[PDB]
């Protein structure tokens, strides 16, 4: 069961945070589309996730494009793949 | 005061010609070239002109003009539409712009406010956005001042708005005009002491010559704050007058001394390098000897500190008096054991000089932690000036900036409190605050902070304050004028920022009042001599004595003017300076390799010296205690062995 | 839980002797647990500027003298500037620190710590001078030691446990020998009375307990040669690969 | 009546290792008192300059000391929130007064009354009962803390020399007066002897010296300054009328004792009192002596001629 949120709208980030909390609680998959459109939201997501216990099977996925709008925190804290 | 000359009378008659038919008019010339003074002088022939000065920043918007009308104008519906006119019936309101070509272009080559004034002029009105109604102008006319587009901070204007506004080029007065006008001033100022009257001519000539030699070298090519316009010259002669008013007797060398002192307090007050300071000092001495073939002594300092009158002073008793004031200041205000040295005296003298003058606003440029704020607070405490500052925190916006400014302006103006602001680089990120400070520096009244019921509260408090002071006002207009006078006389705002040339240029753009309404002080960084004095005078408590220490043939002298046989303490303090001197080279090399450096400021040196003292104390104590333990153990061993 | 190398020890001493409060740059997070253990007895708490309860934690730290750990300091609330400046005012028996909202009493000794998790942080100007930095960097020696400990723990439980216990014993021996010398200084600070003679014979007995250590150094030269000879390329490859 | 100090002081009690905060003359006995910053007060004869006795018991610097009509019950105050009432002849503290919120700057006593005025760093003037030490009244309404207090000789008005650039007068707040730039540093009620003379110079009438290098003679009834004495080098720490009433006696932090004849706005005398700042000043009620306590940790007495 994967939840699918997009990044860029304040409503969108509100629902993304709610879904991340729900998935951490219940161990579900969550995937955020094109996250580079908000460096502040990236900082909040990284620093929130750094200090939480996730249930097994939880997986947070962020899809993005190559650019210097990403903070170094996510590039060091996340397992990275190039496509 | 306006001294007639050819340029003044010509431009004064022509301004009259244009303002009679109420045609808009823009005076183009470098800042401080007498544009505002010339327009105000010409305006007196037209008694119905009520002039209000506008203050364009790089972030100008149409609302800047709009709210101005809301203070100085009223609009009413006439049978032929809606018309806006000044409340002063029978008189036109002249909005005198200062920097028309300052506001940044949009992404597609057009200032918003410039097109707004074009809509004002061409169609005689604008579209009130509350209901999109065509409001026309009855008795308004638009004049402005500007600097040429060749200035890096200024742009050229679109031809559509340039055509409605005739443009008059206002050059600087030039050698002959300065000679005549400041010769008149010098002849006027040398009669409180009659014996000095005969020296009116050689002074004035000297006064201009150095200024010429000071204006053709220190140009904007090197720095963004080399504004050597003749406006500062007006301060110069005023300073000399203020240095001769209470005396009523003085030799010629005293006059030369005050002249050189004002040169040093208006020149070398902004320079960046020791080489330029050396050149300026050498030229001051050279012109002094040229035009006039105690004062010759280099450590020239004046002070309103020791005596009833502003007199020349010597350094040592100055330091002793300073130390006594430090004791009192520590007892009263805060427990901050500062370390004082040769340059602290000059800096506090400068801050006091600014706090003495009217509209004494200031700007400090030096390394952060170099004592700017503490010295500012010290001098503010001494002179009875209450101190206010920005309580910067998270979630701190334009609204709270404006609220704090509102309250402190009320305190400073209504109660006549002589408050001084500590404005710092930590709040220059909100553009609105930058514009607000540009206004307050421009004219001492921000047009829009107090409004509505707040304005009513202001006027009630102003009525009470003026009743206490002794000026009865029955109307809010003249009462607000009195408030403007009080703010003009009372406040002393000071700005602080690192020496980042890009930062200075950005501040000049976003707020040119920071380089036109406040003197700029180049604190820089603690030189080798000052740092050496700090270390030497703070490490006295240590037992840094080596009687047998011998000086090698070659020494790594980091602090100049060491003794030819430097002592042990001398060399140790030289090393204490050198450890901080190394960090500059380290950061330079690291940045050369593209690495990340960090600031190396005097607070690091204070920590270094305090740690050095604590470590020396602890090591000496431990070694002595261990020796005593060893000795007593050996004593008991030998006693029991012999027993 | 401090590591065993010069860099972390230099940081640790930097975290006990200081004049301005320190700013620790932690790429890993070891310094967090280090400060957690160092001042555990004092009920040292931790918070962040982004934390909503930052001001209450601050107030408690000053009032009750309890040290505090502050993390995530790129978003620095400059309200703490007076504290770093050592600016206070004292009225008789009440010493107070100004805080903008109001001036409040503080204990004679409290320690606030600032910690960074991203080494690439460019701090605001107010921190360029008001604190002293502390780099929790990692060098080749630390990584080599970590890799050797990991590989011994994973393949050879006997070798790992033996070397650990033997090194602990050697540290105990050295500490006890120096302590027993210091106690001999303290006692000597013989022929007078039997009581003085009695405690010294037990110390010569514990000089024989150092013969126990003279024998234990020959047993750990045996554990440390095996791992050193068999695990050179692993450690060298680990360090070189990670730094490249 | 013409008591104006000659060139050299005769003797001075140098037995201090801390600065002097106040110096006052005993009314009856031929002695003088001096409070120091070392939580101590010294009492000694001014006619010889030989130490007699000391008052001790405070924990912080003693800022003030005074006398009642005839010495007897002394009142001192120290910056550790404390006031103390002492027996002069015994040189022993008999009462301790507390109930402020900050340090105490100055204190005085009605010479034949039954109450104490105290001026406190927390922006107020505390009125206390002598026998109980209980704050019968508290007078507030300042912006900054108070520097000095002085009661009307008739026990009706209290003059408060604030740090708000103003000097107030309070009904036992009647009025506020403000004609200074810097802190006003000291006050003194005028005697009757000057009452006619002041009318020639141009009540009740007050005197006020300030940090702005000025002294000013003010009147309660109008709230406007009568006279402005200028020419001071530094802050004024003392303003005392003369018994004869023609002369104003003042001291400042400039190593100068100034005696003014206010009848014709002249400076009668300028005496190089000390080698550092003069902290406090007083004159004997009848005897020809004037005492200056200075930052040199000394108290010098000048005979008058
Ligand atoms: N003809 C003149 N000769 C000498 N000095 C002048 C002349 N006109 C103006 N000034 C000086 O210029 C100063 C004002 O400059 P101004 O150009 O009005 O400033 P702004 O930059 O606001 O336009 C005054 O202090 C005055 O002394
Ligand atoms: N010249 C100095 N000597 C000793 N301490 C200083 C000096 N300058 C600043 N400080 C220390 O810095 C603190 C205040 O610094 P601040 O005035 O803000 O410096 P700046 O304004 O140059 O950043 C004080 O606690 C003081 O101890």
Residue numbers in the entry:
A (entry chain A): 4065 to 4147
B (entry chain A): 2567 to 2859, 2865 to 3214
C (entry chain A): 3566 to 3754, 3760 to 3814
D (entry chain B): 92 to 263, 268 to 297, 308 to 410
Study authors write:
At a functional level, Lis1 is a dimer of two β-propellers.
We revisited our cryo-EM datasets of human dynein and LIS1 and, with additional processing, solved the structures of human dynein bound to one and two LIS1 β-propellers to 4.0 Å and 4.1 Å, respectively. In both structures, dynein is in the closed ring conformation and the linker domain is disordered before the hinge region. At sitering, the main contact between LIS1 and dynein involves the same AAA4 helix used by yeast dynein, as well as the same AAA5 loop and the loop bridging AAA3-AAA4. There is a minor rotation in human LIS1ring relative to yeast Pac1ring that causes a slight shift in how LIS1 interacts with dynein. Additionally, the placement of LIS1 at sitering is the same whether one or two LIS1s are bound to human dynein.
